[PDB]
Design an enzyme around this catalytic site. Structure first.
Site, PDB file in Angstrom:
ATOM      1  N   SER A 135       0.849  -1.186   0.000  1.00  0.00           N
ATOM      2  CA  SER A 135       0.000   0.000   0.000  1.00  0.00           C
ATOM      3  C   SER A 135       0.882   1.232   0.000  1.00  0.00           C
ATOM      4  O   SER A 135       1.704   1.397  -0.897  1.00  0.00           O
ATOM      5  CB  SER A 135      -0.987  -0.030   1.159  1.00  0.00           C
ATOM      6  OG  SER A 135      -2.090   0.831   0.906  1.00  0.00           O
ATOM      7  N   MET A 136       0.752   2.098   0.989  1.00  0.00           N
ATOM      8  CA  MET A 136       1.607   3.277   1.014  1.00  0.00           C
ATOM      9  C   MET A 136       3.087   2.891   0.984  1.00  0.00           C
ATOM     10  O   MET A 136       3.899   3.563   0.336  1.00  0.00           O
ATOM     11  CB  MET A 136       1.301   4.121   2.243  1.00  0.00           C
ATOM     12  CG  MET A 136       2.084   5.415   2.331  1.00  0.00           C
ATOM     13  SD  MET A 136       3.424   5.391   3.549  1.00  0.00           S
ATOM     14  CE  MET A 136       2.493   5.311   5.037  1.00  0.00           C
TER      15      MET A 136
END
Length: 234
Positions: free
Chosen positions: A91-92
């Site tokens: 994700s991030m």
């Protein structure tokens, strides 16, 4: 083992071991990657990054920008880096991993692979995310001790949602993208677009699940990681 404030080494690794630098998602901590360390070491030196503002770093002000996370983290990883080295981000963490890859390559440090999970290509970043702007109360609700952790979660989300890709030289290292087939935050095209950010080989693997498919597919992802670093999984 040897760890610093940024880089957590949970298991001992052979001196010959390739290095795997693991970037947690928003709201995640370095401890999230303990299963990777346990399954790949000692054949792989698994390094898990602890961002400011969580757990033992709770007193530190959390960072709010991927480029600031990268700029602060790169010199630290530089002093530890030893090729062959690969990066894994969820994700991030995938965007951070990509930004760190850009910095390794500009410094002449080749990467064995960039593994990016559950995240649109940097050129396909979704604009207009607002989770980081929610009230304290609306924040915790949408995330379904938390107040101690909320500033760090908000800062992480802010970093994920306000990221602006600045075009630059393509990568040359392999990129392996990993996505869930039922993830509202990553379309197939958004994941496939990672191919546009490297001149090296590209592979995309889809899994039955959503944004955190990888909890259900750990052993499979560990075998994919191990294949890239020329090792076996436990």
């Amino acid at each position: 083992t040897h760890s610093d404030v940024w880089i957590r080494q949970y298991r001992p690794a052979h001196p010959t071991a390739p290095q795997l630098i693991c970037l947690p998602h928003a709201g995640g901590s370095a401890t999230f990657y303990h299963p990777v360390a346990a399954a790949l070491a000692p054949r792989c030196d698994v390094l898990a990054v602890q961002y400011p503002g969580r757990q033992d770093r709770r007193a530190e002000k959390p960072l709010e920008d991927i480029d600031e996370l990268a700029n602060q983290l790169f010199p630290v990883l530089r002093a530890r880096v030893h090729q062959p080295v690969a990066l894994f981000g969820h994700s991030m963490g995938a965007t951070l991993a990509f930004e760190l890859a850009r910095r390794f390559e500009s410094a002449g440090i080749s990467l064995e692979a960039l593994l990016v999970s559950a995240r649109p290509a940097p050129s396909r970043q979704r604009t207009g995310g607002t989770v980081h702007l929610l009230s304290d109360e609306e924040l915790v609700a949408e995330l379904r001790l938390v107040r101690m952790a909320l500033p760090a979660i908000r800062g992480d989300y802010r970093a994920a949602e306000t990221y602006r890709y600045r075009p630059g030289p393509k990568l040359r290292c392999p990129i392996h993208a990993l996505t869930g087939d039922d993830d509202p935050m990553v379309t197939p095209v958004e994941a496939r677009a990672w191919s546009e950010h490297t001149d090296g080989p590209f592979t995309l693997d889809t899994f039955a699940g959503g944004h955190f498919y990888l909890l259900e597919h750990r052993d499979a992802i560990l075998g994919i990681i191990a294949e890239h670093l020329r090792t076996c999984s436990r």
